[PDB]
Amino acid sequence: MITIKKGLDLPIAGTPSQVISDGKAIKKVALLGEEYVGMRPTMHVRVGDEVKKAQILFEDKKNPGVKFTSPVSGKVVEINRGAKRVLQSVVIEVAGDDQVTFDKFEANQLASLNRDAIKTQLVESGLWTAFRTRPFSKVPAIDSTSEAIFVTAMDTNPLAAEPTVVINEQSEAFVAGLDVLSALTTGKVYVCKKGTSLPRSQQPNVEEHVFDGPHPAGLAGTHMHFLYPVSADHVAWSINYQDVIAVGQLFLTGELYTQRVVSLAGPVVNKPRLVRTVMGASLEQLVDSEIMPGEVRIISGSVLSGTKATGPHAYLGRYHLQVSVLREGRDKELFGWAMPGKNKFSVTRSFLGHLFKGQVYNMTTTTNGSDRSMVPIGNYEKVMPLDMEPTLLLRDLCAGDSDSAVRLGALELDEEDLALCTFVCPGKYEYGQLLRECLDKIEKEG
Amino acid sequence: DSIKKTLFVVIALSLVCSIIVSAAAVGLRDKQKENAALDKQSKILQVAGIEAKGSKQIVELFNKSIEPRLVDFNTGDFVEGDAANYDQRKAAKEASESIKLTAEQDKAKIQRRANVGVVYLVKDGDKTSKVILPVHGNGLWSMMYAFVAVETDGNTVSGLTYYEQGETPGLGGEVENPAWRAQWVGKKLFDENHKPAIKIVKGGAPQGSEHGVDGLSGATLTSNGVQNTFDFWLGDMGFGPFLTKVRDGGLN
Amino acid sequence: MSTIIFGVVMFTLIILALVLVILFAKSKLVPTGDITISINGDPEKAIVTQPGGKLLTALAGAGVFVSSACGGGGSCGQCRVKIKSGGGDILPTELDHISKGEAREGERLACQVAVKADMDLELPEEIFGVKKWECTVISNDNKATFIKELKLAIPDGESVPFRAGGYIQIEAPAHHVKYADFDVPEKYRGDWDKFNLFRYESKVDEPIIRAYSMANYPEEFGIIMLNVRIATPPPNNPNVPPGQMSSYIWSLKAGDKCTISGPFGEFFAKDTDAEMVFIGGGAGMAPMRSHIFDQLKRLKSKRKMSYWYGARSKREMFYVEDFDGLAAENDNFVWHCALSDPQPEDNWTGYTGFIHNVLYENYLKDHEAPEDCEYYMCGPPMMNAAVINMLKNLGVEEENILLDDFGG
Amino acid sequence: MEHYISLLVKSIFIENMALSFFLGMCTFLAVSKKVKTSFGLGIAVIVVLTISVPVNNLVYNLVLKPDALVEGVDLSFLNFITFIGVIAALVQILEMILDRFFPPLYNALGIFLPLITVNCAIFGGVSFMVQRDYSFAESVVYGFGSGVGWMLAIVALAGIREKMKYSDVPPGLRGLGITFITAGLMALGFMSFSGVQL
Amino acid sequence: KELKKSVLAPVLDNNPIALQVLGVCSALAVTTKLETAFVMTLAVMFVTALSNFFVSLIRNHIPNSVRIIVQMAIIASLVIVVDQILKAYLYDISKQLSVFVGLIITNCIVMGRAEAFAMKSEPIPSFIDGIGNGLGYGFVLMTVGFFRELLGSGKLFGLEVLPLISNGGWYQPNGLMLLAPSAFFLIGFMIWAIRTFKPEQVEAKE
Amino acid sequence: GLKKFLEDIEHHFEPGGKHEKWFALYEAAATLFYTPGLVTKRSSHVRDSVDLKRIMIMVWLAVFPAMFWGMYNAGGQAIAALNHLYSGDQLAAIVAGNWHYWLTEMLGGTMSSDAGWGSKMLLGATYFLPIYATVFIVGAFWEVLFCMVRKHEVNEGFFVTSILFALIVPPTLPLWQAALGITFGVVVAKEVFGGTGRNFLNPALAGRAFLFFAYPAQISGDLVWTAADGYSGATALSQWAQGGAGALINNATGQTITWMDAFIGNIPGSIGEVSTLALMIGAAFIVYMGIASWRIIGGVMIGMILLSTLFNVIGSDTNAMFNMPWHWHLVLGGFAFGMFFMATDPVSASFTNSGKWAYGILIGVMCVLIRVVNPAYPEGMMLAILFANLFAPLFDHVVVERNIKRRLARYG
């Protein structure tokens, strides 16, 4: 058992009710091309083409053999491209239920399958993109293995869903996915969770680890840092509970399981709750008549690390399990910086808000101030639980000293690991993009 | 790049440079001694009230303005009279005569003293018209003369004649004097009762009265020897009972 | 007086003792013995060298030759060699060309490695087939107002085992040449007369080496064709001395003798199926002709191909017959030419402007997937930069843009 | 006991070779951008100084001092050239060691590795030893302390410059000008020992 | 011809202190007085010129192992003979030189130019290079000395141009101009001005 | 309204306007009066409420009790000394010859021996306010000049530097000297390095060091700490060095200086340093809010106590400074002011929790050492802080290298 003591449980309004209900009927899905790290697509379809479920849409130039397949059966209606012809989404309009089928195995045959057969089935089905490698958070090359696969059976993000409610419906699929992963790994499988009970695999090399504390107690970066530190020559893989259920369903039935149970929540949602949806569902149709009037921002994922869902990007991400909606803070206040903040949240104690314990805030998308230099009053140390030097690592990230940042521990990090650091910066910096730039430089350098 | 070539070129260059350096160093030694004698005589005479402005007039100004005389420096008696050009440090090289590890060791940090000290009473015609006496101590090599006014010892101005060289031309804080442009006139730090004292005051008073040494700003460091090299003026070791013999009689 | 003797003798003794100590320390702090540069772990090819100098000099004197674009100046970065055993650190003059990923494998610039101890290398590509030849000039007829076609007769009727896109370094002795020796025809002279370029001259006092690309493809046995442009001083400063080596090459006539170095090169085609697009301009027609002729006449590949060439005017076009024949005979190959500055007597009716503008506004703008093709480039640096920028704006990735220029 | 600790502390802090006497400034300002190389330069300077000072002490006391060899024979004018010859031989052996064992430190020094000979700190230490008339043990302690103080100053400057990776210096001031200003600020920082009579 | 070009280049284009780093210690030390700055400038110029000449005369015979010994023997002999002759005859200025004979030997410009130019050039061009480096060094020395002496004592070359409150004027001297931090700041700002008027000397972003 | 005004004259300061060079000043004024009204664009779509404006406004508000007590104390000390020296007609002639005194008497106050707290604070204000105004204007000139030339935007930090510099000078400092000091501190120590958040030295203590070493007679001695005409008097740190605890006596009133007097602030000195009580009340608020570092403050206290107790244990026969205890070291000089408001500068301190302890311990040790064993300076807080500003990055280096070794051992 590991207890995290440095962190922040963000008190934003509109937490969902942990009861599952069916969602709005969805007529369009898409695969967003900019959310895959180090990916350059080779198109296999074009507008007007009719596809089937698990039919390949495009491949990767930089990762030979990786296939990105269609969540549902329908017709390709849009291929969205932006500046310098960068792929933004391949939108499919649902029609029919044709699909591509695979092999099905019994429940007890999964733990002893061949690793190459497992890899072949995953790559062909397109479920191989559920994995991500630390460092660099990329899809694993189809000719590589790892000694550790980390399963994320917990969720500490603001307004996140409870994995227990979802897993308890699909215990057999979860356990089958765990068996498949145990046969797939060369070392062990780490199931990182809370203190509640989950369905358990009987394989000796599948081990459940319990983490306590506030956010980020539920991040794969924290789990790797505490159980299997990653470096250039030690690489770990990550996957979450919904994708493990999908793996189990695929190997038990021979069909791609594209269902999702996401959380619809936010300060401007009338009835926050959990809704059943489909992979890459259209968010403008998912949130149709679910929110209060006004100008709002719909976010695919958390507010700490999510993707703004507007225009061609208004679809559910591959690695996102919630939708966050909140208002737009474009108001201007007279001497607003000097007011006593009874309704203002801060990790410091310069406002009256912290004296009301349990208070819940109707947060918006405001930047409470302007961009400035770094004056280190010691806020990053309150939110970084890892064994690193936050201020110094952030200053190398800002200055662009990639060689020094690698020594200081950048290879262990993802954009979601610096979300609270971006949160509590008085200089209004944004460290996820700086970390991504440094990691891109390290990758390209060799 | 071979041993023979290396050794030959090294030896040749060493000989060629060393012979020139030795010639230019020791072959001028007598001339350097004459230069030192001139810059001692003229330097002391210019404040002695006689305008001995170099070899253009030294031939008619030296030995026609002063006469040699030397004393014990501890009993107030003459023992011989060769002190026309005499330095006490040159005669103190014989061990540590009369000992210098006594209470005044602060000024006597050199721990070396001849049994005879230099004196200069400007007694060309055997009359004591003016008096000058040297100080000589460690702490930035403080070794100086003083003339002061008629009240205790002499007359007019001294400016603390420097013997040969000041440590720096102005690099750092060190005021033994403002070079030769001293603010001195009728200075007074001695006592007629064997009890003088001196500290860091300056500030307007020294232009006539007393206490004209600062020596630095912010350290009091490389002038501490200068400001402490007059605490030795309690007599006995310093020209004996001379400073109660000032303007008294006899030697006067 | 005796003080002088004492000073001299004591100084000399002290200095001699110091120098003797220095020599004693050096005796045990330098190896002073010879070393062996083993190559691919072979008992032969092992080179015994005096422990000093740069690795390139020892390699050249030992009979193993590598790229010398800068000629040992270390500003080229083309002499990369794989070092396995101890060879020291990687000098900062190398970090500008070798990245860390291949710096781990041992790739180093031979211009900077000084041989101090024994070490092991790994020569790549089996370059041991490089050999010097004393060639014979066959013809030197002009092809453009500033470009000439040169044919080389290899001695003893040999044939270079070269790949399309390879290059050779020509070397010349000391000489002094006048531009009056040139034999440009009158219909090309209509510009040389008005610029009075015959008065120019160049001289050579010590031998030099310059690398040139070859315009022939492997089924052209026994000969080596080159396209050479005269290195005239820039028009803004006519007084500047002209290009020595280009002046030398422009002066030779049939029956003369010249010496080449050997077959090198890295600008080779890719072994995929995808579409092929070739972009050449001015004097860059040599590697393009090599590549297209190798692809079509020898390989008989069915890949889709396209060649876009940009000449200054109708006066500067050449190999038109060969490319027209290839385009007519092959349905896969299609040819286009764009004149930057057409003139009234040219009476041109085709595309004008820059070749990259023509290519974009005719072919790549309406293309289904411009990022799936392979682009090969050779020409002026301004055209290279403009075409690279245009291709980058279309989402084309770097590993699909193959570029060979005139010296990196 | 107390005498030698007083001497060591004085040399390191009260009379600092770099930020109190201001000697060694050329290489102090040039080679102080990385702590990794500044540490090696400091160690090399420590070795050179602590070996050169006592050797010159012996040479002065046994050869060049007046009346040290023969009565009346004074050789006190060979002082500078003898001292610089000893320092140059030591630096020659040091270069021989460095070119073989530490190529990364041979580089990033380049033209300054021979100029360790004309580092003003070494010659100033030897001249101060002659002036103060230390003994052999005091010479060893004084040389070691002076080298340690110079290393401390150069490593402090290297750390400051490494921290300045986040600064935004005007283009005409980056490098030498800002290094001069930084050293002038460090001198003001070190001015707090000025009045100590240790 | 090339003579004026070569003597005037190191003044502003290849300045020993402003573009190289050589002579900084003496530049900090002797710039509280214009007379001392002038004397030091002349001494360094003369010594560097003669040392370059004498080193270049025998550049083909110096072994690599004893090169520093040979160079410093020549330089030290030159400086010592200069000091001896100055003491013998020019006693007046030799007294205000005094403790400064030592820094001339260990001045970085002398041996740096001997290493970089004298060992691969001709005698007369080496002499010209020494004179040019002396001029470049003196430019910085006298520019700093002007400001330091003026603002610290109201005097130039000893002649009083700003009357002092101590003697009955209107000016209060700045006591930081008599300390080395002021020399540091002045040299930094002069480097700023030089690299602003000649932007080709700006160092690359690192 | 002001809002419609600020949105009406906005075009003049965009490119193409009649005032396109004063855009920095317009933006500064606009964002002072109203919040920017911007939104997040990349990630962490919600942000914290804190910013540099609040960070510096709290620190500026934290020194108000100290500033007001300093004004009152300066006035009262000057009045007491003047009535000690002069009386009757000579007092009238002295008052008529000084504009501070006759303006205090003209604004309704009194300068006699029975003056009140209002008159004392008015007299102290006549000394404090001109210095603060000069400092702010002269420093703002350089800040705005650098921002306009280099196309940055003016930022807070000078808001704190100005008041901290104006609160640590003697009440009798010349205004031209104040202008020179603020110029040096702003330009040399901070602006050439990039501005706020990009220097390594303390700007407020860098101009004070310039004044200290350039014009010593106006910032040291006996004639500068009480603003009375012709009054000479030593202060408590300069009296202990001479005679110990028996030498602490207020000459103007004939009363001994007690520990309660030193703690409350009834002593001469720099304007804002005197009241340890007020400084502690001010510093507690910003330590609670999370702006100042309790690690740094605790380190300073630890070092001070350790060295000041070692000196007491060793003892001396000639130095009366060897027997001053820690509770006396605390309530004299600028120790409390420095430890609470200058040692806690985030940019000049260490960036590591382990390094902050060493930073504070070094500051305290150096302050006590300069106080005791250095006879030139009676106080050493400014020099101690400027000395630790050079070695903070070395503590950071040591901590980081230990962390990197731990990381390489695969346990961190």
Ligand SMILES: Cc1cc2nc3c(=O)[nH]c(=O)nc-3n(C[C@H](O)[C@H](O)[C@H](O)COP(=O)(O)OP(=O)(O)OC[C@H]3O[C@@H](n4cnc5c(N)ncnc54)[C@H](O)[C@@H]3O)c2cc1C
């Ligand atoms: C793989 C490869 C292939 C190549 N293929 C070809 C090819 O097919 N055709 C071809 O022509 N070249 C080719 N080159 C370039 C070739 O190597 C030579 O650079 C070129 O032939 C001219 O060289 P040169 O020595 O005659 O002239 P250089 O003297 O090297 O060039 C100097 C040019 O600048 C002018 N100039 C001289 N001095 C100055 C000065 N001080 N300031 C300003 N201007 C000055 C000269 O008048 C002349 O125009 C190739 C290079 C490589 C590496």
Ligand code: FES
């Ligand atoms: S002159 Fe260069 S180190 Fe002193």
Ligand SMILES: [Ca+2]
């Ligand atoms: Ca004495």
